[PDB]
Design a protein around this nucleic acid. Structure first.
Lengths: 111, 111, 111, 111
DNA sequence: AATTCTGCATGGATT
DNA sequence: TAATCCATGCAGAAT
DNA sequence: AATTCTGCATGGATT
DNA sequence: AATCCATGCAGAATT
DNA sequence: AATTCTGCATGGATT
DNA sequence: TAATCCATGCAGAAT
């Protein structure tokens, strides 16, 4: 056995995503591409560690938006600014295979 | 099957660690607590991935010093340069189980 | 407020303890005297600090094994090795008061 | 090489401690009992490891207050936020030997 | 030549 | 004091 | 044109 | 009547 | 009353 | 233009 980290996708935080309300809008291509598929209104909870083993629990959810859905991680506020990261910076999602483990990272703006 | 990340230790890079000399000094308590034990001064190769998939292979090695040992990773220059680390930034090592895979991260210095 | 460590109990590591499977077999008297009570043998996740300050989360669990049980901590091998313990060395458990925080420690064998 | 944690003391975080001023009042009894002695208002830098192995540097310092002193750690807001603590939670300090290193941990309020 | 690379030595800071 | 640790110095070996 | 920083000062709250 | 600490607060320093 | 949170629905952006 | 996406606004809800 030998494991490998695979990057899945990335999101740069909007002002809305960052803090306050507590939800992060996931790019919908990426959300269904790499995260679990859900049809249920309020979808599954997701559990994801960072590189230091710090576990986080979000609710992975949709909103019907017109014809199609809008994807969110709810319950993000501790993670964002327990990792002390504000708006316009980027949060990253990767995966450990085999086993499909979700791990997240975070890069601050280029300047 | 469920996988789990545990933090191992951190090192804040000295000018020699980030220097062109291409070596990183590991604290001896941390090297023996968390990296595989080594008998021969000629070390062992260690492979370490970051969040973004970029794997590195360093030589984990020691030097006789007084009577005790001094521990180093050699071959970090590709890694330093690539994640763009300077002296005073911090490199962190944590580990994935089962499989004892080594993963690294980094935070930039506060100023 | 001022804090106090109370020693609870010791185990001499068996050849089966830690190792590839990574479980530490607890004497049933000590698990029920000192660890939180558990009804289902799935157990609970338990958090324990080692003599290095490091916190770990192991699974506190049993197997029924006829009427009586056999109790284990799972996920101990990185921690045991961190303390440089080998079979025949000793694993120790202590309590911090107030608060009953559990500490996992170690003294190596008489030779 | 005998490893051993010694617990030193605890403090319950006030709204000013958990606040964003970033100074933590050490009770003068504990501050003089366990931290290195300081003669002069201008403090010394102090390094404290957290339970997950990350190093933090605060300023250990005092203020004249009536005839006696009032002691503080400055620069705690990122660290306090890191442990997801708020007013009424508890911060604890221990001393890992060999090396006399300070460890800071924390348990959240009873609810 | 003169520079870089290797392996250990040494010394400032801390326990 | 006495001891330890680790950032860096600095002598050969090698470009 | 604030906010944050400082260096305390004051006062509520325990004995 | 003491003492200790959570917080007020009034200038200085920094947007 | 009056701020917080839920679940959308609107409309600028970016294919 | 065409269709979505996604940043955010904003009413019934709920504290």
């Amino acid at each position: 056995l030998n494991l490998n980290i695979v990057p899945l996708f990335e999101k740069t935080l909007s002002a809305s995503d960052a803090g306050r309300i507590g939800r992060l809008v996931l790019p919908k291509a990426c959300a269904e591409a790499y995260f679990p598929p859900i049809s249920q209104s309020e979808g599954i909870p997701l559990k994801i560690q960072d590189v230091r083993g710090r576990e986080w629990t979000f609710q992975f959810r949709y909103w019907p938006n017109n014809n199609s859905r809008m994807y969110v991680l709810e319950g993000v506020t501790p993670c964002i600014q327990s990792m002390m990261l504000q708006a316009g910076d980027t949060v990253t999602f990767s995966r450990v295979d085999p086993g499909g483990k979700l791990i997240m990272g975070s890069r601050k703006a280029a300047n």
